[PDB]
Amino acid sequence: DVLPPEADSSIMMLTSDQKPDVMYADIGGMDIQKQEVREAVELPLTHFELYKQIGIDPPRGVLMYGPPG
Amino acid sequence: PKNPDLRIAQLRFLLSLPEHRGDAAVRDELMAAVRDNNMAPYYEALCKSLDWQIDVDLLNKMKKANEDELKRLDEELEDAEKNLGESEIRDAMMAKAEYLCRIGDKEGALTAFRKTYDKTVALGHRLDIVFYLLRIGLFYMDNDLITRNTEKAKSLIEEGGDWDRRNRLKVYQGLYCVAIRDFK
Amino acid sequence: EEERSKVDDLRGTPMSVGTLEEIIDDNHAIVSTSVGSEHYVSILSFVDKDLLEPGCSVLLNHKVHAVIGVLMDDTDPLVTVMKVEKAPQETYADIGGLDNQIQEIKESVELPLTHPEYYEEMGIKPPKGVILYGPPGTGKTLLAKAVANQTSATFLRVVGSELIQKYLGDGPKLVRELFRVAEEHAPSIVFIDEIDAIGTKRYDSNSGGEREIQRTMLELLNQLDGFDSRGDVKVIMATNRIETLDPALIRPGRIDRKIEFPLPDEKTKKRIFQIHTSRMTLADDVTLDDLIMAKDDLSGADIKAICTEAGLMALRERRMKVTNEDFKKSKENVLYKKQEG
Amino acid sequence: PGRIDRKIEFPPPNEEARLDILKIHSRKMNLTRGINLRKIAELMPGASGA
Numbered sequence A: 001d002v003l004p005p006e007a008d009s010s011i012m013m014l015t016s017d018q019k020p021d022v023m024y025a026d027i028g029g030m031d032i033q034k035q036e037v038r039e040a041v042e043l044p045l046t047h048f049e050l051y052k053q054i055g056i057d058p059p060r061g062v063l064m065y066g067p068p069g
Numbered sequence B: 001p002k003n004p005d006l007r008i009a010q011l012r013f014l015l016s017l018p019e020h021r022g023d024a025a026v027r028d029e030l031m032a033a034v035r036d037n038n039m040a041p042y043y044e045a046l047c048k049s050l051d052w053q054i055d056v057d058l059l060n061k062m063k064k065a066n067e068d069e070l071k072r073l074d075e076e077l078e079d080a081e082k083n084l085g086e087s088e089i090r091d092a093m094m095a096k097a098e099y100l101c102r103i104g105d106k107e108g109a110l111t112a113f114r115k116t117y118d119k120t121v122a123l124g125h126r127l128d129i130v131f132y133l134l135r136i137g138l139f140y141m142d143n144d145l146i147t148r149n150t151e152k153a154k155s156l157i158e159e160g161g162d163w164d165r166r167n168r169l170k171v172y173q174g175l176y177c178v179a180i181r182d183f184k
Numbered sequence C: 001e002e003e004r005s006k007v008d009d010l011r012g013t014p015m016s017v018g019t020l021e022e023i024i025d026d027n028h029a030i031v032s033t034s035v036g037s038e039h040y041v042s043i044l045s046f047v048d049k050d051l052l053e054p055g056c057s058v059l060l061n062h063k064v065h066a067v068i069g070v071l072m073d074d075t076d077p078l079v080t081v082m083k084v085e086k087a088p089q090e091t092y093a094d095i096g097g098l099d100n101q102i103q104e105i106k107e108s109v110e111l112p113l114t115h116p117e118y119y120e121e122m123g124i125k126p127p128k129g130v131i132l133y134g135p136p137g138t139g140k141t142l143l144a145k146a147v148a149n150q151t152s153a154t155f156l157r158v159v160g161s162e163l164i165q166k167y168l169g170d171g172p173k174l175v176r177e178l179f180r181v182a183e184e185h186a187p188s189i190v191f192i193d194e195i196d197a198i199g200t201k202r203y204d205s206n207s208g209g210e211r212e213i214q215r216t217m218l219e220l221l222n223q224l225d226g227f228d229s230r231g232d233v234k235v236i237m238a239t240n241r242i243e244t245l246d247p248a249l250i251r252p253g254r255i256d257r258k259i260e261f262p263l264p265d266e267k268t269k270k271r272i273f274q275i276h277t278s279r280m281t282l283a284d285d286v287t288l289d290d291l292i293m294a295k296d297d298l299s300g301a302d303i304k305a306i307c308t309e310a311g312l313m314a315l316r317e318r319r320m321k322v323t324n325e326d327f328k329k330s331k332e333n334v335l336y337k338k339q340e341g
Numbered sequence D: 001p002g003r004i005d006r007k008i009e010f011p012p013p014n015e016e017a018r019l020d021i022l023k024i025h026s027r028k029m030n031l032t033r034g035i036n037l038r039k040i041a042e043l044m045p046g047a048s049g050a
């Protein structure tokens, strides 16, 4: 018989329920990075069909660089 | 390259049912018959409409000039097929071949369609072929072959995604749903 | 007979393929197989123990790690690069103007091996190879002498310093194996063209350095000098610029013969056009005098490319015969190519 | 040394080359037909194909 799923193995999942540290009210400086990330993360995650309507394939690729800061 | 023939379907339906219209409905039809050299489409209407008098040499020199225009492309392919390429020959013949069957009946079209379906590696010309099946499906009010290629085109289209041809198909299924009775 | 039905029961059915580590005069051989395992094997059969030598692949019978038979398996990375073949249709008779240049190298490559009777009785024996070069970008015209050589004996071509210095070395060992494999295929010809080892600017990938590059080249000289190998594996060197290579390389080889490639004259260029256009069909109005007069310092492949582009342009009209107006208009394309930048 | 290879130039994007290719990439995204492809391409000189 196979794995349920999913009972792992390793990592594991969860552990993030008692976290995270602070909300997003902290960093307000960027505002041009958040407009990219928010649209590249929470919008495709909330509505999968809205992209198929307009005929644009939402990517999953998010790359960040520049530190410091 | 469709509406000149589509309005002919309009005028054939305009002539068929009412027997009271003997003037403006035949005049525009002959106006479109003297042009594009529609040959087979007017025989079925010649049995219902008047037999004249004379057509004969007027449309015989036009169908012989259409056969000279037909045989000049048929004489261009074997000089073209001596050289070789990708689609540059077989696609050169099919468009004018479906226009040459636009002159008459379903024959040259139905052979050209299954001919070009094995040529094109993209859906661009495929769905164009489908549109030819739909326009002829309206002329001969034959709903048999238009329900098939449409089902096959929707799968190649949505693999996949489109704008112009997608919204086109949205109207096509509306024309079929209004041909039969589907209101919703 | 009965031995075939006997020894097979000892090795089979399963068996492993290991490597030989070292041999002991007690007929116990130490074998190494995946991964990191040792043993004492003593077998008196199928050996061939003297020809094996450590560093070769041997079988391992499960019980117990015994070697029934010897396996020499190639394959191998380097053995793949020597063949095959070509045996090209081109000959040394398809080139002209270098008759005075070619006479000595053709003689030097056919000096040994074929026509040995006047060589062996004279007791000369200069088996150090030959060295080629020329301007501006030729050396392929000297390769047009290697095609005739490919028609005879065995040939191998190793060109470019990238094959060593692209990564860290281990230096020459890649060349060191070429020597010995060519010794197993002796007689064979090894040709090297365009040696940039000292002429390169930027190394490939991440490797260093300018002076380590030199040391792998120097070990190539001692390999080539050499102490002590009499085998051939005849070696031929060629490049564009001989001034880059160090004079340290000339005494071991080639001390007897090196050739220089001169620029072709009017008579030679006429011959060249003759040889290429032999197979081609040209219009009656094409003359060979004005063509070579208008051209200044061009090799065979230049007059080749202008004909190739003339036939390519003639394919647009689907004509097998190239007219002189089409030929000149096509010629102006390569003429404008070299003159654009 | 001019020997041997085939010479083919890679052209920069052109206006008339921008029109058709614009439609091509516009084939996958739902839009109305009130869009003027003539004026939109002239506003983008140079740049690149990508």
Ligand SMILES: Nc1ncnc2c1ncn2[C@@H]1O[C@H](COP(=O)(O)OP(=O)(O)OP(=O)(O)O)[C@@H](O)[C@H]1O
Residues within 6 Å of the ligand: C094, C095, C096, C097, C098, C137, C138, C139, C140, C141, C144, C194, C268, C271, C272, C275, C299, C300, C301, C302, D001, D003, D004
């Ligand atoms: N006299 C001649 N007769 C016939 N062919 C000739 C003659 N001289 C030169 N050629 C041809 O012209 C060609 C010249 O080659 P070329 O020098 O262009 O090569 P290359 O591209 O420079 O090689 P590399 O880049 O390795 O230096 C040769 O292949 C040779 O066959």
